[PDB]
Design a protein around this ligand. Structure first.
Ligand SMILES: [Cl-]
Ligand SMILES: [Cl-]
Ligand SMILES: [Cl-]
Length: 94
């Protein structure tokens, strides 16, 4: 899985890279092309387990979501209140 030419594990493990995508998702900074695509699918990923997504979109989104839930907890809270206010992902799929 890659976003904008970069391995996604690599983005997730780097504060600098991840903070760029986090800001994109939080409407606080400009999105890269794949960051904007992640933004489009993130509420579906959280609220329906990416029911209508392609497997590729879904695999990347679930990787991001589970990493952030476990390793970037404050950022997870921000993303969850914005994209999954009913907390459906943690309650109903994970
Ligand atoms: Cl690209
Ligand atoms: Cl890419
Ligand atoms: Cl850290």
């Amino acid at each position: 899985t890659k976003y904008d030419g970069i391995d996604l594990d690599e983005i997730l493990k780097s504060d600098r890279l991840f903070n760029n995508y986090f800001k994109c998702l939080m409407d606080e900074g400009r999105c890269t092309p794949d960051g904007n695509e992640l933004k489009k699918i993130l509420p579906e990923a959280l609220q329906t387990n990416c029911a209508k997504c392609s497997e590729k979109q879904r695999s990347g989104a679930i990787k991001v979501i589970n990493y952030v839930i476990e390793n970037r907890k404050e950022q997870w809270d921000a993303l969850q209140k914005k994209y999954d206010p009913e907390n459906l992902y943690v309650e109903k799929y994970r």
